[PDB]
Amino acid sequence: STVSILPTSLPQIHRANMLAQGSPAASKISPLVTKKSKTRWHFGIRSRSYPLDVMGEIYIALKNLGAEWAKPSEEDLWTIKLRWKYIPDLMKMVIQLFQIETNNYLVDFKFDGWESSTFSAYPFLHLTTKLIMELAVNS
Amino acid sequence: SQEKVSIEQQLAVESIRKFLNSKTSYDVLPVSYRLIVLDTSLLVKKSLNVLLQNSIVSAPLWDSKTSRFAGLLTTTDFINVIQYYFSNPDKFELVDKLQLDGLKDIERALGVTASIHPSRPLFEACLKMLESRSGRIPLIDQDEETHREIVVSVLTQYRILKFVALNCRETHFLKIPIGDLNIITQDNMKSCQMTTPVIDVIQMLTQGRVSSVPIIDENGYLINVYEAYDVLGLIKGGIYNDLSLSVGEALMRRSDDFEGVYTCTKNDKLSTIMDNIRKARVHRFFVVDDVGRLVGVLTLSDILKYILLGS
Amino acid sequence: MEYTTDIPAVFTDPSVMERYYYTLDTSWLTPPQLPPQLENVILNKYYATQDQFNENNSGALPIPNHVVLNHLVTSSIKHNTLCVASIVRYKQKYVTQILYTPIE
Ligand SMILES: Nc1ncnc2c1ncn2[C@@H]1O[C@H](COP(=O)(O)OP(=O)(O)O)[C@@H](O)[C@H]1O
């Protein structure tokens, strides 16, 4: 095999050769450093407010954004079964409230299809972005 | 001996072609993987950070206003905006304000795209990439409820060649020297020297429509290469003065984790080439002579074309 | 199901929940505990296993729990940009569809 890595193409050797030449840029121009920081991902969003308070804020935000929702019974109060406009045109979502700890709650958002194996979550991702922002503005 | 090497090369290629004809683009997809998409209203500068932060050179764009995908952000988009900004230095204060949809407008105004269904044969995906003269192709399907076309993934020539290499031991029987195959591009090489202004090298990329420009010295010895990808690090810092540097100086911006330029000779074999593609992200092999003078380049498209269509 | 833009009285009227709490004879009145499948340790392990395979050739690409499919994944706002995702099924494979959108 005569397949190799060209030594002069490595940044260390290229910089060193430029330095030896006398070029000012060799000392002054630094390599690009990209801080690839590891993101902590979560499902949905967290709130320290209590259930009725949190649910109220979501419904408020939902109303201002133009969503409609089903009437919840006593057995599913912490579940929002909503529909949103954005050919099936109405997007369905299920929002669910969970308790993490005593004072800590997690809001769960779930894409639930469209109304009149292979699908794009992007319309859902965009609308949830709108919703999350509306929730931030109101706080 | 010669006849043996030849028929074995022929058996290996026919086997690789059958493989490509028998697999689909869907098959190349990992069982679980991530797809990064950018909203068209995102700033170009931020989008560049997203690429560099996530170790990718490309991303599909999403127009939220119309619920439609809007093509791909690639290094070419950044190449085109550099030339625009250089020829119009007054606009530099607008870099900070330029959004991806704006960037696409600028390119359209300056007068400066292939897709495939996952179910189609991998062979056909390769043909379409050769026809479009690009190293990547979006995988497109229809949303089963909305019937909006959606991007499932983006496949590259690299990923396909690596897929072939990982699954086909037959590559080891590709023992004919590449110089005997007439697959090296040797004629009308676009090249430069370390003292060439980087803007001129960037022009060569667009004018020649190549991904890289080999840097030689006065005697024709290969020293380094400037790649389309290098333009991303050039923008990240300070567009203003970096565009005025020589290629030698602009290269100082290369990250220390740059993997290096790969070279080979005419006596090298596709078996070796495929082993290298298998073990590392290599996008081209510069062909040098016995003393390290540039004689040509062998790119992923050159290798794929040979596998699909022969010499 | 019927749909309307009327926020359920239980969230606007203190009389409704009060009514429920006084007519006791239990878990309905408190939202359910977070399922183990939605904890961030499991979600980020899933992300790390993909990274360990693609960058370090260790282990094998992870299959996500089917219960977390089509659920919103989020991260802290950075540089006025919100990054959201959802792990979704494509035929028999799993795509984490990721969107970067500018906010304000
Ligand atoms: N600097 C160059 N000068 C002349 N031809 C080149 C150069 N770089 C690549 N080529 C040739 O042009 C074609 C496409 O080049 P390139 O875009 O770099 O490869 P790919 O299409 O595989 O990414 C190939 O046939 C390749 O051999």
Numbering used by the authors:
A (entry chain A): 465 to 550, 562 to 591, 608 to 630
B (entry chain C): 8 to 119, 124 to 322
C (entry chain B): 303 to 327, 335 to 413
Text taken from the publication that reported this structure:
The SNF1 protein kinase complex plays an essential role in regulating gene expression in response to the level of extracellular glucose in budding yeast. SNF1, like AMPK, is a heterotrimeric complex, consisting of a catalytic subunit (Snf1 in yeast; α in mammals) and two regulatory subunits (Sip1, Sip2, or Gal83 in yeast; β in mammals and Snf4 in yeast; γ in mammals) (Hardie, 2007; Hardie et al., 1998). SNF1 activity requires phosphorylation of a threonine residue in the activation loop (T-loop) of the kinase subunit (Thr210), and three protein kinases have been identified that phosphorylate and activate SNF1: Sak1, Elm1, and Tos3 (Hong et al., 2003; Sutherland et al., 2003). Using a tricistronic expression system, we expressed and purified a regulatory fragment of SNF1 from S. cerevisiae comprising the C-terminal domains of Snf1 (457–633) and Sip2 (304–415) together with full-length Snf4 (1–332).
Here we show that ADP is the long-sought metabolite that activates SNF1 in response to glucose limitation by protecting the enzyme against dephosphorylation by Glc7, its physiologically relevant protein phosphatase. We also show that the regulatory subunit of SNF1 has two ADP binding sites. First, we examined nucleotide binding using analogs of ADP and ATP carrying a coumarin fluorescent reporter group in competition assays. These experiments revealed two distinct nucleotide binding sites; AMP, ADP, and ATP bind with similar affinities at a tight site (Kd,I for ADP ∼80 μM) and at a weaker one (Kd,II for ADP ∼800 μM). In order to discover the location of the tight nucleotide binding site on SNF1, we carried out AXP and NADH crystal soaking experiments. Data sets from soaked crystals show strong, well-resolved electron density for AMP, ADP, and NADH at one of the four canonical nucleotide binding sites on Snf4 (labeled site 4 according to the convention suggested by Kemp [Kemp et al., 2007]). The tighter site binds AMP, ADP, and ATP competitively with NADH, whereas the weaker site does not bind NADH, but is responsible for mediating the protective effect of ADP on dephosphorylation. Two lines of evidence lead us to conclude that binding of ADP at the weaker of the two binding sites is responsible for protection of the enzyme against dephosphorylation. Second, the half-maximal effect of ADP on dephosphorylation of SNF1 occurred at a much higher concentration (>500 μM for recombinant SNF1) than the Kd for the tighter binding site (∼80 μM), but close to the Kd of the weaker site. Presumably reflecting the weak binding constant and the lattice packing, we have been unable to obtain crystals of SNF1 with nucleotide present in the weaker site. Given that the linker region is not conserved between mammals and yeast, and that ADP has been shown to bind to site 2 in the S. pombe homolog of AMPK (Jin et al., 2007), we think it is likely that ADP binding at site 2 in Snf4 mediates the protective effect against dephosphorylation of SNF1.
